[PDB]
Write an enzyme that holds these catalytic residues in place. Sequence first.
Site, PDB file in Angstrom:
ATOM      1  N   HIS D 202      25.170 -23.552  61.679  1.00  0.00           N
ATOM      2  CA  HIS D 202      25.145 -23.369  63.122  1.00  0.00           C
ATOM      3  C   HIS D 202      26.295 -22.528  63.652  1.00  0.00           C
ATOM      4  O   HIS D 202      26.186 -21.975  64.746  1.00  0.00           O
ATOM      5  CB  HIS D 202      25.168 -24.737  63.781  1.00  0.00           C
ATOM      6  CG  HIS D 202      24.992 -24.698  65.257  1.00  0.00           C
ATOM      7  ND1 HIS D 202      23.804 -24.345  65.852  1.00  0.00           N
ATOM      8  CD2 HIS D 202      25.860 -24.951  66.260  1.00  0.00           C
ATOM      9  CE1 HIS D 202      23.946 -24.393  67.162  1.00  0.00           C
ATOM     10  NE2 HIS D 202      25.183 -24.759  67.437  1.00  0.00           N
ATOM     11  N   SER D 206      21.405 -17.977  61.199  1.00  0.00           N
ATOM     12  CA  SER D 206      20.720 -17.541  60.001  1.00  0.00           C
ATOM     13  C   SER D 206      20.884 -16.044  59.815  1.00  0.00           C
ATOM     14  O   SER D 206      21.179 -15.307  60.751  1.00  0.00           O
ATOM     15  CB  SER D 206      19.240 -17.889  60.080  1.00  0.00           C
ATOM     16  OG  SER D 206      19.050 -19.285  60.156  1.00  0.00           O
ATOM     17  N   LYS D 228       5.784 -21.683  63.850  1.00  0.00           N
ATOM     18  CA  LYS D 228       5.854 -20.983  62.575  1.00  0.00           C
ATOM     19  C   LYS D 228       6.318 -21.905  61.451  1.00  0.00           C
ATOM     20  O   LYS D 228       5.970 -21.687  60.289  1.00  0.00           O
ATOM     21  CB  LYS D 228       6.757 -19.765  62.710  1.00  0.00           C
ATOM     22  CG  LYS D 228       6.719 -18.825  61.549  1.00  0.00           C
ATOM     23  CD  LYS D 228       7.656 -17.680  61.732  1.00  0.00           C
ATOM     24  CE  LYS D 228       7.622 -16.786  60.534  1.00  0.00           C
ATOM     25  NZ  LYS D 228       7.703 -15.371  60.919  1.00  0.00           N
ATOM     26  N   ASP D 229       7.066 -22.959  61.773  1.00  0.00           N
ATOM     27  CA  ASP D 229       7.357 -23.992  60.792  1.00  0.00           C
ATOM     28  C   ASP D 229       6.140 -24.851  60.539  1.00  0.00           C
ATOM     29  O   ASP D 229       5.889 -25.250  59.399  1.00  0.00           O
ATOM     30  CB  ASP D 229       8.504 -24.875  61.270  1.00  0.00           C
ATOM     31  CG  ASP D 229       9.856 -24.239  61.072  1.00  0.00           C
ATOM     32  OD1 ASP D 229       9.908 -23.050  60.711  1.00  0.00           O
ATOM     33  OD2 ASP D 229      10.871 -24.919  61.319  1.00  0.00           O
ATOM     34  N   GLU D 272      11.963 -34.049  33.095  1.00  0.00           N
ATOM     35  CA  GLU D 272      10.973 -33.478  33.995  1.00  0.00           C
ATOM     36  C   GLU D 272      11.116 -31.965  34.049  1.00  0.00           C
ATOM     37  O   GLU D 272      12.146 -31.411  33.674  1.00  0.00           O
ATOM     38  CB  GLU D 272      11.109 -34.057  35.391  1.00  0.00           C
ATOM     39  CG  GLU D 272      10.456 -35.400  35.568  1.00  0.00           C
ATOM     40  CD  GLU D 272       9.008 -35.318  36.010  1.00  0.00           C
ATOM     41  OE1 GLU D 272       8.338 -34.303  35.743  1.00  0.00           O
ATOM     42  OE2 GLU D 272       8.533 -36.282  36.639  1.00  0.00           O
TER      43      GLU D 272
HETATM   44  C1  HEM Z   1      16.378 -37.455  47.070  1.00  0.00           C
HETATM   45  C2  HEM Z   1      15.099 -37.779  47.101  1.00  0.00           C
HETATM   46  C3  HEM Z   1      14.470 -38.452  45.969  1.00  0.00           C
HETATM   47  C4  HEM Z   1      14.057 -37.899  44.813  1.00  0.00           C
HETATM   48  C5  HEM Z   1      14.170 -36.454  44.431  1.00  0.00           C
HETATM   49  C6  HEM Z   1      13.500 -38.938  44.037  1.00  0.00           C
HETATM   50  C7  HEM Z   1      12.981 -38.706  42.767  1.00  0.00           C
HETATM   51  C8  HEM Z   1      12.339 -39.692  42.068  1.00  0.00           C
HETATM   52  C9  HEM Z   1      11.587 -39.484  40.916  1.00  0.00           C
HETATM   53  C10 HEM Z   1      11.350 -38.177  40.228  1.00  0.00           C
HETATM   54  C11 HEM Z   1      11.108 -40.671  40.526  1.00  0.00           C
HETATM   55  C12 HEM Z   1      10.244 -40.890  39.326  1.00  0.00           C
HETATM   56  C13 HEM Z   1       8.789 -40.916  39.763  1.00  0.00           C
HETATM   57  C14 HEM Z   1       7.922 -40.929  38.551  1.00  0.00           C
HETATM   58  O1  HEM Z   1       8.111 -40.103  37.644  1.00  0.00           O
HETATM   59  O2  HEM Z   1       7.006 -41.763  38.460  1.00  0.00           O
HETATM   60  C15 HEM Z   1      11.558 -41.630  41.432  1.00  0.00           C
HETATM   61  C16 HEM Z   1      11.272 -42.955  41.337  1.00  0.00           C
HETATM   62  C17 HEM Z   1      11.618 -43.882  42.300  1.00  0.00           C
HETATM   63  N1  HEM Z   1      12.280 -43.618  43.437  1.00  0.00           N
HETATM   64 FE1  HEM Z   1      12.896 -41.954  44.003  1.00  0.00          FE
HETATM   65  N2  HEM Z   1      13.568 -40.094  44.700  1.00  0.00           N
HETATM   66  C18 HEM Z   1      14.146 -39.878  45.886  1.00  0.00           C
HETATM   67  C19 HEM Z   1      14.439 -40.760  46.916  1.00  0.00           C
HETATM   68  C20 HEM Z   1      14.246 -42.119  46.801  1.00  0.00           C
HETATM   69  C21 HEM Z   1      14.753 -43.091  47.666  1.00  0.00           C
HETATM   70  C22 HEM Z   1      15.577 -42.796  48.884  1.00  0.00           C
HETATM   71  C23 HEM Z   1      14.339 -44.318  47.193  1.00  0.00           C
HETATM   72  C24 HEM Z   1      14.573 -45.686  47.670  1.00  0.00           C
HETATM   73  C25 HEM Z   1      14.598 -46.080  48.931  1.00  0.00           C
HETATM   74  C26 HEM Z   1      13.604 -44.063  46.028  1.00  0.00           C
HETATM   75  C27 HEM Z   1      13.026 -45.043  45.294  1.00  0.00           C
HETATM   76  C28 HEM Z   1      12.413 -44.766  44.091  1.00  0.00           C
HETATM   77  C29 HEM Z   1      11.799 -45.840  43.349  1.00  0.00           C
HETATM   78  C30 HEM Z   1      11.746 -47.273  43.767  1.00  0.00           C
HETATM   79  C31 HEM Z   1      11.290 -45.325  42.238  1.00  0.00           C
HETATM   80  C32 HEM Z   1      10.604 -46.233  41.246  1.00  0.00           C
HETATM   81  C33 HEM Z   1       9.554 -45.721  40.266  1.00  0.00           C
HETATM   82  C34 HEM Z   1       8.378 -45.159  40.986  1.00  0.00           C
HETATM   83  O3  HEM Z   1       7.757 -45.880  41.778  1.00  0.00           O
HETATM   84  O4  HEM Z   1       8.020 -43.991  40.776  1.00  0.00           O
HETATM   85  N3  HEM Z   1      13.557 -42.726  45.807  1.00  0.00           N
HETATM   86  N4  HEM Z   1      12.313 -41.016  42.376  1.00  0.00           N
HETATM   87  C1  HEM Z   2      18.224 -30.915  50.877  1.00  0.00           C
HETATM   88  C2  HEM Z   2      18.075 -29.613  50.741  1.00  0.00           C
HETATM   89  C3  HEM Z   2      18.304 -28.601  51.776  1.00  0.00           C
HETATM   90  C4  HEM Z   2      18.018 -28.589  53.105  1.00  0.00           C
HETATM   91  C5  HEM Z   2      17.375 -29.615  53.991  1.00  0.00           C
HETATM   92  C6  HEM Z   2      18.444 -27.349  53.592  1.00  0.00           C
HETATM   93  C7  HEM Z   2      18.284 -27.030  54.928  1.00  0.00           C
HETATM   94  C8  HEM Z   2      18.483 -25.758  55.374  1.00  0.00           C
HETATM   95  C9  HEM Z   2      17.967 -25.278  56.571  1.00  0.00           C
HETATM   96  C10 HEM Z   2      17.167 -26.089  57.545  1.00  0.00           C
HETATM   97  C11 HEM Z   2      18.341 -23.994  56.672  1.00  0.00           C
HETATM   98  C12 HEM Z   2      18.018 -23.075  57.806  1.00  0.00           C
HETATM   99  C13 HEM Z   2      16.624 -22.469  57.690  1.00  0.00           C
HETATM  100  C14 HEM Z   2      16.647 -21.408  56.644  1.00  0.00           C
HETATM  101  O1  HEM Z   2      17.470 -20.482  56.741  1.00  0.00           O
HETATM  102  O2  HEM Z   2      15.856 -21.458  55.684  1.00  0.00           O
HETATM  103  C15 HEM Z   2      19.087 -23.671  55.537  1.00  0.00           C
HETATM  104  C16 HEM Z   2      19.653 -22.450  55.303  1.00  0.00           C
HETATM  105  C17 HEM Z   2      20.308 -22.202  54.112  1.00  0.00           C
HETATM  106  N1  HEM Z   2      20.417 -22.977  53.036  1.00  0.00           N
HETATM  107 FE1  HEM Z   2      19.749 -24.689  52.862  1.00  0.00          FE
HETATM  108  N2  HEM Z   2      18.969 -26.614  52.623  1.00  0.00           N
HETATM  109  C18 HEM Z   2      18.921 -27.301  51.484  1.00  0.00           C
HETATM  110  C19 HEM Z   2      19.361 -26.955  50.211  1.00  0.00           C
HETATM  111  C20 HEM Z   2      20.040 -25.782  49.957  1.00  0.00           C
HETATM  112  C21 HEM Z   2      20.440 -25.320  48.711  1.00  0.00           C
HETATM  113  C22 HEM Z   2      20.216 -26.088  47.444  1.00  0.00           C
HETATM  114  C23 HEM Z   2      21.056 -24.096  48.901  1.00  0.00           C
HETATM  115  C24 HEM Z   2      21.658 -23.166  47.939  1.00  0.00           C
HETATM  116  C25 HEM Z   2      22.554 -23.500  47.030  1.00  0.00           C
HETATM  117  C26 HEM Z   2      20.992 -23.823  50.277  1.00  0.00           C
HETATM  118  C27 HEM Z   2      21.495 -22.700  50.851  1.00  0.00           C
HETATM  119  C28 HEM Z   2      21.125 -22.316  52.124  1.00  0.00           C
HETATM  120  C29 HEM Z   2      21.489 -21.010  52.630  1.00  0.00           C
HETATM  121  C30 HEM Z   2      22.285 -19.984  51.890  1.00  0.00           C
HETATM  122  C31 HEM Z   2      20.988 -20.943  53.860  1.00  0.00           C
HETATM  123  C32 HEM Z   2      21.093 -19.806  54.810  1.00  0.00           C
HETATM  124  C33 HEM Z   2      19.951 -18.854  54.565  1.00  0.00           C
HETATM  125  C34 HEM Z   2      20.002 -17.811  55.624  1.00  0.00           C
HETATM  126  O3  HEM Z   2      19.722 -18.107  56.796  1.00  0.00           O
HETATM  127  O4  HEM Z   2      20.332 -16.656  55.326  1.00  0.00           O
HETATM  128  N3  HEM Z   2      20.357 -24.848  50.889  1.00  0.00           N
HETATM  129  N4  HEM Z   2      19.161 -24.772  54.738  1.00  0.00           N
END
Ligand code: HEM
Ligand code: HEM
Lengths: 126, 57, 247, 385, 385, 62, 93
Positions: D202, D206, D228-229, D272
């Site tokens: 901010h 962008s 557009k989003d 994965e």
């Molecule tokens: C950052 C976002 C998250 C990612 C990327 C993520 C990723 C994953 C992945 C890849 C699995 C395995 C699923 C499978 O292969 O079957 C998993 C399982 C699980 N995640 Fe997450 N997770 C996220 C957020 C959360 C949060 C916030 C919670 C709890 C409030 C949660 C609860 C669980 C639970 C309970 C499982 C149990 C196995 C299943 O039901 O698949 N996750 N998560």
């Molecule tokens: C939880 C994951 C993320 C969220 C929610 C997030 C959110 C955002 C949002 C809402 C914007 C503004 C819209 C846009 O420009 O596309 C943005 C811009 C950006 N994000 Fe992320 N972001 C994430 C992960 C990342 C990662 C992993 C990177 C790179 C390492 C990254 C780098 C950037 C950059 C460089 C911009 C500016 C792009 C530009 O306007 O030129 N973000 N992000």
Amino acid sequence: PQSFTSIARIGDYILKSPVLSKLCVPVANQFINLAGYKKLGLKFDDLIAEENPIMQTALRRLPEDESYARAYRIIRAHQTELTHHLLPRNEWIKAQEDVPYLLPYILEAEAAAKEKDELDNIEVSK
Amino acid sequence: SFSSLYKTFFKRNAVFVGTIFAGAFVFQTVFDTAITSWYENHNKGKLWKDVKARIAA
Amino acid sequence: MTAAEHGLHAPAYAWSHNGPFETFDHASIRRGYQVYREVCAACHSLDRVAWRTLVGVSHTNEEVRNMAEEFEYDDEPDEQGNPKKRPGKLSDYIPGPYPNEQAARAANQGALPPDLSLIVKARHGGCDYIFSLLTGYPDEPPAGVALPPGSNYNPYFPGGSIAMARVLFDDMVEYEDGTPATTSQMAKDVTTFLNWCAEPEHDERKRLGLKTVIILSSLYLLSIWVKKFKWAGIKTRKFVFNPPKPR
Amino acid sequence: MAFRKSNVYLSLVNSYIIDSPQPSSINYWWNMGSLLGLCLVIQIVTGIFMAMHYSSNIELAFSSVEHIMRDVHNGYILRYLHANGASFFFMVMFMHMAKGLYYGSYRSPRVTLWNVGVIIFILTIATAFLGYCCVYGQMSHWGATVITNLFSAIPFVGNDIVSWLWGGFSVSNPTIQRFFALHYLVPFIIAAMVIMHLMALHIHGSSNPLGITGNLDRIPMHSYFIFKDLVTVFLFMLILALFVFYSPNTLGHPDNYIPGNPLVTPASIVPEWYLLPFYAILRSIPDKLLGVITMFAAILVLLVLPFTDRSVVRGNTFKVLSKFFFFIFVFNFVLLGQIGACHVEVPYVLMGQIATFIYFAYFLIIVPVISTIENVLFYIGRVNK
Amino acid sequence: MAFRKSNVYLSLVNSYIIDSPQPSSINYWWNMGSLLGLCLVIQIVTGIFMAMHYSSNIELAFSSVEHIMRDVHNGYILRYLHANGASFFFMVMFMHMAKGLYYGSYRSPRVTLWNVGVIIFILTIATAFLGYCCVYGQMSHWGATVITNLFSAIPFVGNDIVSWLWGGFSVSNPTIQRFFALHYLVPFIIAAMVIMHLMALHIHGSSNPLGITGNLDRIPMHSYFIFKDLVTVFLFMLILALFVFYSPNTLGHPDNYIPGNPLVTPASIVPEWYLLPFYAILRSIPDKLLGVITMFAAILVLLVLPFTDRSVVRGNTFKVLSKFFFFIFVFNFVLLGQIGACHVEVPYVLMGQIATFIYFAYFLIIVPVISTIENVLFYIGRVNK
Amino acid sequence: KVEVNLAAIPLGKNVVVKWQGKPVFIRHRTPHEIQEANSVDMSALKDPQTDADRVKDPQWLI
Amino acid sequence: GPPSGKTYMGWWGHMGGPKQKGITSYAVSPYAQKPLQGIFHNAVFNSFRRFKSQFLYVLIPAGIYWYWWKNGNEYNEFLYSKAGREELERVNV
Ligand code: HEM
Ligand code: HEM
Ligand code: HEC
Ligand code: HEM
Ligand code: HEM
């Protein structure tokens, strides 16, 4: 973040040489044509990134008519790419029109900043 | 008469979103019925009530 | 690695539930339960499937009540504390043949039969691997293999040597609807039943997927129109530039 | 003034999503951030509604996951939505990072934005690994074993930290309960870092696909980029609904439906699909300490990028060699991911070593050399002397 | 400018805790907020390190808590710290609210700050009720059943909302796993609401015990109020270490060391001590629907306070009747808390009804009448006519 | 530290116990290959080794 | 709060671009326009123009890496065949 004095030094050594000017300038012209910023109605000095104090001083010291022309070319480029088209072929920036206009301002601001940072680290010969 | 259509459906936002909610209600109901009848008809002879009526005869 | 230790790939059979609008053939699930109970239940277990999940899918209520009451489960003990047994109810799970892993490994020459309630999701190949494995026993292991004793040849199994002999032979199960129970018929039915056991949500998942894909593609195209409407003023915006007079 | 500005909270909402001036020239690659925010909301809500039914012991993890799949209502929707949503989260995050690497979004005003993004990338890699480990299938046990056992190469402290990670002497009930508590925790740290990502964004706004300044014409975010989003929001929901309702186990591995067995190794242990390039980078070094250092340096090489970009023009829109070598880097990443799913066999280790060298020579050798060559070409193509 | 101002994050940290201009007149009651921040961090960290060992099934909850006590290294420190720190969090929160309605902090520039405070109070009550329900003792189980069977008094959808809360038909395994997932979750909502509490405070700044404006001399928060808060931090840690190490099961009930048994009622079901006044309010009304309406009204009556305070000077520092009736209110709250721990015997139902009436007549009757009387006494004591 | 033991074990059969995440051979040692074990290679193999430090028990491998 | 550092984007009124003179912009109400105008012309001609401009950059590295992957895959299939064991031993050790 390559300084324009470095670019100008290498480029002038290329352009004043007999052999590699006649080799390296045609590939540069093909590079300029394939870049395609002219098809959006932009000169190259509109493409230089301006969020640094050297370019801010050069854009402040740029004269008033050139700044209005640059502002219109930027707004037209944004409006053109917003519609995913190009400018029509009579609106393309021609090769004799693509001049370096911001380059002397950038070069004098860069020379001033390099002289400033050489004087800040000066050491008297005592 | 598009003027009367506008003035009774799109002029006030209250009747606009009330029409949106009433349409969402009846759409949800008859869309579920249409999809379930097409699905049960496309899978004919494969469902359990078909198998049960077959083994009940 | 060698295609031997990879295992030969199972081909693509034309299953009646392959396809995005298709449903499990429930008559083949009923026949596959018969094939499981009369052949597969001697070695493998099904302990993730309750009895009540069969009601209204492959059997009626009375049929699953009788098939549960023909087994004995552990009850809570009596007023004297001695352990007590109980005839099965709908809440109970389908019991396996062996009381532990050691009885299974003892009765099957060291090897342990896997629990079959998730086996078509646990093998790369799906139902095609299970069908090709059950029907893919050659009469002789091909020329030159050093087959260990107690092991059988099946080329779809990785390595070749499987500790399960060929168990499906023709007319070993009589179907109560009169279907000719060949080897491939019984393998088809038991593979459909195992696929139901792995994914009992299959039909409702595909129905809800139809509703969801229709509603979301409706919304996607309609949002393309609303974006182009709201953005028309910015897309069709014109700029003119008359250079100002110098002062 | 208007109440959406006069209020404490509504002015934050206004200043970020309503009146926020966006450059008018930005294309559909700028919807990936809003898409990642929607992905994060999806993951958090479905994770809470599955953790209401999940048990985290070594005895009850797998069977509680199938209790979610079998007898809780719409539990298959929740689990397939969580798993495929995590995979879609990583695909959209790779698109966000590759957009930022294409269009020069890492450059001079937005380096703090790039660094907070890299921190977010590390934290969601960790979250997805722990959540895979909470399923306690066969792939998750042996993936946890390999990745945790990589920390034994630290020469003085490594055995003590791997015993502290495990909570014991191998991956067992303490390890699975630890991994569940951390997989629940780290997404809130990710949400806080997303708020800091937006706060760093901010202050400068962008970028735009020209790379030139966008301060000249700007349009508010409301009723232009909101809709557009919404286009890509509904498109993403459609593609995710396809993968959840019609091919729910395609992006997975079938070995996770075998319950976890410390006594059977599954003969091809892969993580994965999105961790596969870093797995191939780790595998392609014939050492263990150098392997774990090279994988962590492969995630941390994205911070060297604002200092090795030696060009005066922001982005790759108007450069031809930078476009060519950018797509070489992208398909090198895809080959690295395909190599990480193959066995340790003869052509694949040389392919993994050469692709690792290309991955590291992009940021450190290719980008400076190509960008200064492009600078000198831009100069001498149009000045005459 | 300085780097602590010319950053994005350090600008926020500087503006809130370093260069924040505080009125110099504020006494030691203005440390309760930083104390509640310390308490919240204590609860979150010790709860995470206990959730690494807690199992949430109904057959494993209680024994997992004793596994934390007996088998985990320093786990009795964690459990006693979490329980007594929760109770200390509520004593400090009661002091924060009593300061706020003594010194008139609820009044017209800060009504949104007062309301965000009331939302935080409701959320902390819910968090502690769920966390007491997770340990699954005898008071835990029967407290869960009486508080959830409160919601069966709603005459149309009451049975279905209580069967939706329970996850079944009485408090069992789905209820306990639900209550664990929510008892994790609601603290991070509390952290978000605390950030919003600070944002609503920061626009107008804090009050002072004089009630006059504090705009005339002000002190930066660093090096003055940092150390004045450090005094109370070390005092609070001292008193908490006393209760944790020398007297740990004092504030608790002994019946939470009986495991939960659905067939034996423990003959006096009382919640933890801080919910006793609202329990007595609920118990005083001879109807269940009006009982829960009156309990929620007893905590939502803090919102009518900025509209019933009818006086022109802020706070009770210079009023005698406001001081007297304020301490009548405070000892009415303490008597209400002691009535809530007694049985429904013959003087106690009348004492609880009269104390509930005094609790409601304070906000709705006593504060307007005393405010108007003090207004006209302040006028005619010093104007001549 | 598990203490599984020996007097209920004859030979004709292996034991492969697993404990502490440890799948591990334990077996009585035959005369037959106690000196096939002292018949071995030293570095016509990958294994310049010593059976004395490998198995300090003459009669019991683990 | 205090003012923070100098940025490169202000707000509505003080964005921080240059002064603008002589640029006039015109626009029509979308309610008076045709949305979806020119979609069938842009769908076939503009799509081909954008594809023709930006496809060698994407499809030459894709061709290089796909040919490399297919060649390595064919060599790995040859090495673990019966015809190619006698290279596999002298290749690995
Ligand atoms: C950052 C976002 C998250 C990612 C990327 C993520 C990723 C994953 C992945 C890849 C699995 C395995 C699923 C499978 O292969 O079957 C998993 C399982 C699980 N995640 Fe997450 N997770 C996220 C957020 C959360 C949060 C916030 C919670 C709890 C409030 C949660 C609860 C669980 C639970 C309970 C499982 C149990 C196995 C299943 O039901 O698949 N996750 N998560
Ligand atoms: C939880 C994951 C993320 C969220 C929610 C997030 C959110 C955002 C949002 C809402 C914007 C503004 C819209 C846009 O420009 O596309 C943005 C811009 C950006 N994000 Fe992320 N972001 C994430 C992960 C990342 C990662 C992993 C990177 C790179 C390492 C990254 C780098 C950037 C950059 C460089 C911009 C500016 C792009 C530009 O306007 O030129 N973000 N992000
Ligand atoms: C008696 C003993 C039986 C009978 C009657 C059946 N099976 Fe099979 N099975 C059995 C053993 C001991 C093993 C382990 C073999 C090994 O080394 O893995 C198996 C294996 C399977 C598998 C797994 C194949 C694989 O690992 O890829 C499946 C699937 C399987 N068995 C299914 C199956 C079906 C569908 C039957 C129907 C009548 C069946 N088995 C019979 C032991 C026995
Ligand atoms: C808002 C702050 C919190 C409050 C007020 C709070 C309150 C409580 C209370 C009163 C108990 C019962 C203590 C007992 O009698 O044994 C409890 C138990 C528990 N809380 Fe919290 N809690 C908070 C934060 C957390 C968080 C964030 C977690 C999870 C990470 C957590 C995890 C637990 C656990 C696991 C128990 C189990 C029983 C025990 O070990 O005592 N708490 N909580
Ligand atoms: C998690 C709990 C809470 C935290 C962390 C918190 C934090 C703070 C902090 C740090 C302050 C400034 C210092 C102070 O004035 O004491 C403050 C002020 C205030 N809080 Fe809270 N608070 C909490 C709960 C509440 C509650 C429950 C209420 C009342 C309903 C409330 C109402 C107020 C008011 C009115 C002020 C301003 C007092 C004044 O300065 O005059 N807060 N809060």
